[PDB]
Structure 1
Amino acid sequence: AEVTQLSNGIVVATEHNPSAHTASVGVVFGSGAANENPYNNGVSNLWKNIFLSKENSAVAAKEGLALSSNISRDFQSYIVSSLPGSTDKSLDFLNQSFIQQKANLLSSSNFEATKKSVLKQVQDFEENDHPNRVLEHLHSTAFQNTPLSLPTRGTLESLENLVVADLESFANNHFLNSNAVVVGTGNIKHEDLVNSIESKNLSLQTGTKPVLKKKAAFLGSEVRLRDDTLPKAWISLAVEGEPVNSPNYFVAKLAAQIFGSYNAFEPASRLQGIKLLDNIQEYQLCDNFNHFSLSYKDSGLWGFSTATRNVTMIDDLIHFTLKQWNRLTISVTDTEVERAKSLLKLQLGQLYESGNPVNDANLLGAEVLIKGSKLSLGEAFKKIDAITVKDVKAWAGKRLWDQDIAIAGTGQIEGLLDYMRIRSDMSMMRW
């Protein structure tokens, strides 16, 4: 169960795991929905859907093998699951239908059907869903005029102005050989190490990825969509996280576990926890938490999110969460750090060791492109056992003391005071 890298034209990384028996070859691209300017937003989505429709229709009738994909910010994650002993067919299909040719798939009728399906899907996502809506709005507001804030799906206005030529140009400017790993997560050992190097298994347009000019930034802003028709509320605070490949990633993740998740409709969640959960339960202040610390190569975000049925006590929820964040950098009980360490160990163990090979393939590709070499979870355990209260205190004092916050919540938000009793209260306590 050891990961092996190399560099022979295309980086090939394998993580044998004899436990599961669903071999899943894959392809991962390091430039997704961030390295592209806002005027052509949904090109990655169009690629994703043309794949997932026509190639999914073809594969099963040809052989037996599913297929999936993903995109977060810079991840043309692109996976072809299979049986343990049919990976050569998977690579043959992947060669013959994804990198070449790109003309038989991009037919007019097929492209237009994909276009209308994507339009319908983005439309009803904008209508029905809500937490993901406010999350995308949070990203957009935190990175204004930065190639990081445009959504993964896109905007209908941007979608409507795409036919072929721009999709072809993106294909020729980001499907290179410089940044295209070939993941082999599953129960394959070395066939992936050799078959990936053949006569022509090499991406078209060898060259480099065109680097964007501006890097990133941060500045606080609101994109609220205040509308009283919807029943509940939604908020999403944020403070600038830690970028991947920094010696603060894991301590930030720990700071994103002391408070932890919550769900006020469970007998096993309303009762445990920390001081804020004791202080909230007296009334029905809130209805959900979600603490997270997202990180990307450009920069990272330390998240927060609720969905509160109560609409009049929003300010009290906000004030209590802010006081907890304020005092996280003044005094933390050592037992709190210990419990956070144990819980976070559990969370990473669950995430990295899911029985589904696709998620492991995704994460292996992510790390191998960004870090350059996978960091085994064992080293994660050893390097997290040494996180002491001094380190968390220092990191919190650096990242959470009078800092810009981005908030963008839909629903009924009129009870939320606008910006000064939501920011200048974030250090008011006499430290």
Structure 2
Amino acid sequence: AEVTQLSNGIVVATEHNPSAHTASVGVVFGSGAANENPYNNGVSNLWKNIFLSKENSAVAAKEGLALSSNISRDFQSYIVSSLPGSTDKSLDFLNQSFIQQKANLLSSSNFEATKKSVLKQVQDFEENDHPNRVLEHLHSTAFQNTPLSLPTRGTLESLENLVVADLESFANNHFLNSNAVVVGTGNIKHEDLVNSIESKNLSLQTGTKPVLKKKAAFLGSEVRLRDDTLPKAWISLAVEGEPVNSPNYFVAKLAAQIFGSYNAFEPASRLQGIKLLDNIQEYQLCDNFNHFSLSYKDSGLWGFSTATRNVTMIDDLIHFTLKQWNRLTISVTDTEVERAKSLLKLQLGQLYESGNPVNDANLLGAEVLIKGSKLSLGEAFKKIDAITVKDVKAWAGKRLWDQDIAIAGTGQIEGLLDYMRIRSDMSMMRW
């Protein structure tokens, strides 16, 4: 259980697992939706779907190869999967169809067919997926007029004016050897992957990606998208949090685990050791909530999201939740900290030790692109067990107590009160 990195001008990372039955090989780039502008937003989402189109997936299926891809704000992925004794064929396909030749993929017929499907994907998302479009709107009001505001799928208006030239320009600027990591997970040995690469030569482009003029900045604000015909209210609320490669990275994750997640219709979720639940269940002000701590290269967010059918008691839900947050500065106990320690270990122990090599490749490539190295799971546990009550109170006194907030909501949100009555609940006035 250890990763091995080498460099030849091309970075090559690998987590070998001898007891698996598959192998994944791919390339991860260090540019995401936070590396484009409002005019070409969605060009990366359209690159993913050109990779996964028919005539490229057909050519892989005849050889016994499956394909995958993912777009995020800091990185992109293009992965190939196979049986363990078929990994050299995986690398060849990744060489031919992607890095060297792509005139086949950017044809006039394949481009229009791909654009039609992607527009239908995005239009469907904006009309039916309410919890996820409110979290995207939160990012856009918190980080307005900065690169961390742009949605990852793109916007239906900017996505309509794209041509092949926009794709080719974006490729020449960001798909570069200086901005790339080659990964390998599952039943694959490091030496074999290194040997297979030097037998070929395998370079995409040289480097010099553009530098981004503006840095990400948090701004307290709100955006309300009112729709009285929907049957619920969906709300998300956050403060500024921690970026990746911060000293307070695990302390913010432990603090989110203290308040946790809830489903009203599951019996065992009603019995969790969370003091907020003593307040909501007597009048049943929500159906579910979840606390998050999101982290990027430049900034982060810390907060919660909720959905509810009780549209006359929204102000009691927001009030009781924000008063529990105040206790992290003033009166958090030792039992609440020892519970969140061991449940955080179980959480990220399941994220980093699933059975899917595709998830391993995305995690590995994104971490090595920032830190140059991966922190093992035995090391992360020791940092978590060394946190005390004093560290939590010091973090909360700086990040939560009387600080500005960002809010987004949709649906039946008449009962959501104004900004300054919610902002005033961030301090207790009884301390």
**Contact 2:146 2:217 survives alignment (8 Å):** yes
**Contact 2:88 2:196 survives alignment (8 Å):** no
| Distance across 2 between alignment mates of 1:55 and 1:245 | 41
SS at match of 1:289: strand
Q: 1:401 to 1:28 in 2, by over 3 A?
A: same
| Distance across 1 between alignment mates of 2:19 and 2:124 | 39
Q: CA RMSD in A?
A: 1.3
SS at match of 1:275: coil
Q: 1:120 to 1:335 in 2, by over 3 A?
A: same
**Contact 2:4 2:190 survives alignment (8 Å):** no
Mark the runs of 5 or more structure 1 residues left unpaired by the alignment: none
Q: Deviations over 1:95-125 (max 9, x none)?
A: 0011121211101110000001000000000
- Greater mean deviation of Cα atoms: 143-152 or 191-200: 191-200
**Contact 2:57 2:67 survives alignment (8 Å):** no
**Contact 1:184 1:192 survives alignment (8 Å):** no
Q: 1:43 to 1:196 in 2, by over 3 A?
A: farther
SS at match of 1:222: strand
- Greater mean deviation of Cα atoms: 192-201 or 411-420: 192-201
SS at match of 2:95: helix
Q: How far has the Cα of 1:62 moved from its partner?
A: 2.9
Q: 1:403 to 1:158 in 2, by over 3 A?
A: same
Q: How far has the Cα of 1:50 moved from its partner?
A: 0.9
Q: 1:123 to 1:287 in 2, by over 3 A?
A: same
- Greater mean deviation of Cα atoms: 203-212 or 247-256: 203-212
| Distance across 1 between alignment mates of 2:163 and 2:37 | 17
Q: How far has the Cα of 1:59 moved from its partner?
A: 3.6
Q: How far has the Cα of 1:20 moved from its partner?
A: 2.2
Question: Greater share of strand residues, 1 or 2?
Answer: 2
Q: How far has the Cα of 1:56 moved from its partner?
A: 4.9
Mark the runs of 5 or more structure 2 residues left unpaired by the alignment: none
Q: How far has the Cα of 1:389 moved from its partner?
A: 0.8
**Contact 1:175 1:203 survives alignment (8 Å):** no
2:395 paired residue number: 395
**Contact 1:9 1:202 survives alignment (8 Å):** no
Q: Deviations over 1:330-349 (max 9, x none)?
A: 11110110000010000010
Q: How far has the Cα of 1:317 moved from its partner?
A: 0.5
**Contact 1:59 1:66 survives alignment (8 Å):** no
Q: How far has the Cα of 1:191 moved from its partner?
A: 4.6
Q: How far has the Cα of 1:52 moved from its partner?
A: 1.1
Q: 1:49 to 1:393 in 2, by over 3 A?
A: same
Q: 1:138 to 1:240 in 2, by over 3 A?
A: same
Q: Deviations over 1:263-314 (max 9, x none)?
A: 0010111122211011111111111111110100011111310011111111
Q: How far has the Cα of 1:192 moved from its partner?
A: 5.1
Q: How far has the Cα of 1:403 moved from its partner?
A: 1.3
Q: How far has the Cα of 1:357 moved from its partner?
A: 1.1
Q: 1:154 to 1:105 in 2, by over 3 A?
A: same
**Superposition misfits of 4+ residues, deviation over 4 angstroms:** none
Q: Deviations over 1:172-201 (max 9, x none)?
A: 000011120011011101255424633664
**Contact 1:259 1:273 survives alignment (8 Å):** no
SS at match of 1:154: coil
SS at match of 1:235: strand
**Contact 2:57 2:66 survives alignment (8 Å):** no
**Contact 2:237 2:304 survives alignment (8 Å):** yes
Q: How far has the Cα of 1:428 moved from its partner?
A: 2.6
| Distance across 2 between alignment mates of 1:69 and 1:26 | 9
- Greater mean deviation of Cα atoms: 247-256 or 268-277: 268-277
SS at match of 1:224: strand
Q: Deviations over 1:115-165 (max 9, x none)?
A: 010000000000111111001101111110101111001111100110111
Q: 1:282 to 1:114 in 2, by over 3 A?
A: same
2:141 paired residue number: 141
Paired residue total? 431
| Distance across 2 between alignment mates of 1:192 and 1:242 | 38
Q: 1:293 to 1:60 in 2, by over 3 A?
A: same
**Contact 1:218 1:404 survives alignment (8 Å):** no
Q: How far has the Cα of 1:46 moved from its partner?
A: 0.6
1:64-83 to 2 correspondence within 5 Å?
A: 64-83=64-83
Question: Greater share of helix residues, 1 or 2?
Answer: 2
TM-score (ref. length: structure 1)? 0.97
TM-score (ref. length: structure 2)? 0.97
Q: Deviations over 1:348-369 (max 9, x none)?
A: 1011001111111111111101
1:97 paired residue number: 97
Q: 1:239 to 1:19 in 2, by over 3 A?
A: farther
**Contact 1:225 1:409 survives alignment (8 Å):** yes
**Contact 1:95 1:201 survives alignment (8 Å):** no
Provide the identity percentage: 100
Q: 1:123 to 1:190 in 2, by over 3 A?
A: same
Q: How far has the Cα of 1:211 moved from its partner?
A: 1.0
| Distance across 1 between alignment mates of 2:207 and 2:354 | 36
| Distance across 2 between alignment mates of 1:156 and 1:25 | 33
Q: How far has the Cα of 1:71 moved from its partner?
A: 1.5
1:24 paired residue number: 24
Q: 1:93 to 1:18 in 2, by over 3 A?
A: same
| Distance across 1 between alignment mates of 2:20 and 2:409 | 41
SS at match of 1:424: helix
- Greater mean deviation of Cα atoms: 257-266 or 220-229: 220-229
